[PDB]
């Protein structure tokens, strides 16, 4: 009975994975087996999506979240996002799923059969949470792996066929990226943009050059930091600043994952570059802009002078000015004038929307895109009735941008809760009062009265 019961480990069954905090072998098996489940789900889900995929329908009408990730990397797709060969999706699917068996085999082996603690079987693999040197080394290795992984995306984009570029001339297309952006004024200018409207911090990245460039920086930085922590041990200010325990390390990562979860939420909701609207559906801003475009086009066809049409409020019915003067679509969509999209930028001039391009240069593909995007706005119900909340049943649709943003907000919020939980516990644990107040030396009893 090596832990495995409350009386010896000190934890109840509902907190039983805490019985592993000091069993490095059994703990390794939990992590590898869990990784197996992650790889498994990436495997099963792709195949499920592939089985259910109808290449005639848009990806965003079919409840697909993983195939749009593979399409974005360049595989399986042609001009305009049209699917040309589904075989790469199959490959991606099967190879993960096969991989999950070897991961699961290793996890179940280490969790059940192998040594419960690695420290006696090998000084390299075993560890103590309190070894500040061993810990930074493990961190340093995983850092290197991350930088390598980052550079793999650079490899795909520069040497192995490129990436899907929604901005690419002529409706979008896969494109090899040959001049990534290395100017650190651009790459790190993204980190210093404010997160508010019309700036959007790193969510505003709108071209594959900046994307590929930034992953070159991140990969090199991760590799340098991997080496750094492999060779160094933490300095005194860092030693005095942190809690050095297994659970405190968990709380740190929980915090980080929370932060990343919230950013991803906003990435999928606002960004139409690394989440192409061809695959993911229009953004909220994009759909709302597309509606004003749609009715500009309709009314102009009937002979309306869209630039001088005074609306009910006194503001223009179709066109007004943003607060800094740019010409923008009218109505409630005035909140979305920061939107940028390949179907709309051809009408942009130095002052915003150009009345002469509006009068003359609107192609049928833009009228098509804007009708398509407006009738696929990311609104819909939990049971996938597409539309506003007062719509009748008919359209079976929820935008994958809605699906991805809602789920990752929920996940990011619960991991912040997990951060606070485990951080506070880790501090209390380290100070010696996570199990309660010592009756024989209750601290408050030794303090002066407040009044």
């Amino acid at each position: 009975a090596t832990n495995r019961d409350q009386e010896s480990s000190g934890f109840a069954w509902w907190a039983g994975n805490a019985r592993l905090i000091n069993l490095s072998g059994k703990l390794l098996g939990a992590h590898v087996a869990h990784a197996g489940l992650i790889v498994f789900w990436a495997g099963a889900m792709t195949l499920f999506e592939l089985a259910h995929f109808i290449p005639e329908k848009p990806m965003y009408e079919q409840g697909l979240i993983l195939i749009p990730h593979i399409a974005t990397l360049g595989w399986g797709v042609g001009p305009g996002g049209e699917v040309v060969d589904t075989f790469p999706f199959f490959v991606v699917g099967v190879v993960h799923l096969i991989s999950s068996a070897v991961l699961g085999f290793g996890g179940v082996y280490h969790a059940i059969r192998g040594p419960e603690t690695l420290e006696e079987y090998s000084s390299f693999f075993g560890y103590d949470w309190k070894d500040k040197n061993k810990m930074t080394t493990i961190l340093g290795f995983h850092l290197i792996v991350l930088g390598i992984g980052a550079l793999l995306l650079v490899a795909k984009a520069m040497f192995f066929g490129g990436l899907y570029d929604t901005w690419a001339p002529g409706g979008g297309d896969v494109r090899v990226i040959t001049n990534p952006t290395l100017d650190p004024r651009v790459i790190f200018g993204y980190l210093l943009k404010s997160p508010f409207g019309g700036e959007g911090w790193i969510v505003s990245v709108n071209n594959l050059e900046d994307v590929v460039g930034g992953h070159i920086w991140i990969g090199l930085i991760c590799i340098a930091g991997g080496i750094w922590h492999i060779l160094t041990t933490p300095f005194g200010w860092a030693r005095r600043a942190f809690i050095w325990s297994g659970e405190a390390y968990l709380s740190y990562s929980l915090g980080a994952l929370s932060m990343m979860g919230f950013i991803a939420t906003c990435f999928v909701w606002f960004n139409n570059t690394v989440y192409p609207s061809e695959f993911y559906g229009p953004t909220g801003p994009e759909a709302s802009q597309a509606q004003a475009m749609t009715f500009l086009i309709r009314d102009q066809k009937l002979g309306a002078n869209v630039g001088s049409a005074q609306g009910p409020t006194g503001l223009g019915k179709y066109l007004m000015r943003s607060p800094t003067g740019e010409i923008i679509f009218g109505g409630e969509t005035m909140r979305f004038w920061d939107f940028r999209g390949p179907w709309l930028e051809p009408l942009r001039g130095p002052n915003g929307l150009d009345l002469n391009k509006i009068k003359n240069d609107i192609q049928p593909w833009q009228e098509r895109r804007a009708a398509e995007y407006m009738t696929h706005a990311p609104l819909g119900s939990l049971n996938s009735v597409g539309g506003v909340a007062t719509e009748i049943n008919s359209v079976n649709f929820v935008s994958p941008r809605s699906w991805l943003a809602t789920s990752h907000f929920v996940l990011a919020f619960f991991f912040l809760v997990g951060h606070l939980w485990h951080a506070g516990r880790a501090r209390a644990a380290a100070a010696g009062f996570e199990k309660g107040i010592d009756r024989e030396s209750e601290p408050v009893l030794s303090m002066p009265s407040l009044d």
């Binding site: 909220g284 409630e332 979305f336 506003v388 209390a428 996570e434």
Partner: protein
């Protein structure tokens, strides 16, 4: 010792009548800025063009409101999610017109309340306490983020955030129902269970401990004098309260472990309010409540209305009237 250590000891001193602390160093100025701006705006601010359509809504007492109708009005739809500090306006008058005080109040307040959460952790650590009171506060805090930040983000405008006012709140709730059928959303149904159940369990626990208070007073004095602050013994017989409540239902539907009982009291409303906050936060991204409009049809194909279709009729009346001058195009997409 040196001046910096003297300051650090004062900041973290457990002898201050109010604990300051490092979270308190951020919390105090941001809460004071939010509070002073709110009180002045609620009393005196001139009308605010919330919807960006040159149709100012009067929110303040001096401009003809009372306690129930007055509000700090959300900032203009023309601003969207843009940052609008005082220094971006061309004049205080322009900043007042477009609802600038709303942004200043909510950012200072969200920041200050987040440190309030942290400050609860901090004092719990200086006192030798277990740390999770702050986890409980995260449920009201998350709910506040949902209505002041997350929901404006999803809809693209702080003008769709909740007003700082009594009737403004109701306005926010009614418009939210029309556009998301929040009543039909299970996270809100979880929040109702959370707070109904919280109130019930609050009444239950209060009534049960009071019912089993040990006789310690005469009938002329308040029984509250039967408890002395800091006494070691308990003032009620939990076994007697179990013996009553076990028989009221059955023996095992009743708690006899005080620690399990109180963790249940913490967990129930915290979880429910987490869910309803998650409900607002995900309806920010237009994943709405169940839509059963015309879900029942007969052998010919006639719509057989349910109560869901009646709810939709009321939702439609809110939809077509809200922000009556603000829409030019037939779909209200955000």
């Amino acid at each position: 010792a040196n001046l910096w250590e003297r300051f650090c000891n004062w900041v973290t001193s457990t002898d201050n009548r109010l604990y300051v602390g490092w979270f308190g160093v951020i919390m105090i100025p941001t809460l004071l800025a939010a509070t002073i701006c709110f009180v002045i705006a609620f009393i005196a601010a001139p009308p605010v063009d919330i919807d960006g359509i040159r149709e100012p809504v009067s929110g303040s007492l001096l401009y003809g409101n009372n306690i129930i109708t007055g509000a700090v009005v959300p900032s203009s739809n023309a601003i969207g999610l843009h940052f609008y500090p005082i220094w971006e306006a061309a004049s205080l008058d322009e900043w007042l017109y477009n609802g600038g005080p709303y942004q200043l109040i909510i950012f200072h307040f969200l920041l200050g309340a987040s440190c309030y959460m942290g400050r609860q952790w901090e004092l719990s650590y200086r006192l030798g306490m277990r740390p999770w009171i702050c986890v409980a506060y995260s449920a009201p805090l998350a709910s506040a983020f949902a209505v002041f930040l997350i929901y404006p983000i999803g809809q693209g405008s702080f003008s769709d955030g909740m007003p700082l006012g009594i009737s403004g709140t109701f306005n926010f709730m009614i418009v939210f129902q029309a556009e998301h059928n929040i009543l039909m959303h299970p996270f809100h149904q979880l929040g109702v269970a959370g707070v109904f159940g919280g109130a019930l369990f609050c009444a239950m626990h209060g009534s049960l401990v009071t019912s089993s208070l040990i006789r310690e007073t005469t009938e002329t004095e308040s029984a509250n004098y039967g408890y002395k602050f800091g006494q070691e013994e308990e003032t009620y017989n939990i076994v007697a309260a179990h013996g009553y409540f076990g028989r009221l239902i059955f023996q095992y539907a009743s708690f006899n472990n005080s620690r399990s009982l109180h963790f249940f009291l913490a967990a129930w409303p915290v979880v429910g309010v987490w869910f309803t906050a998650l409900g607002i936060s995900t309806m920010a991204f237009n994943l709405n409540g169940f839509n059963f409009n015309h879900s029942v049809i007969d052998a010919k194909g006639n719509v057989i209305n349910t109560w869901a279709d009646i709810i939709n009729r009321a939702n439609l009346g809110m939809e077509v009237m809200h922000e009556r001058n603000a829409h030019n195009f037939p779909l209200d997409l955000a």
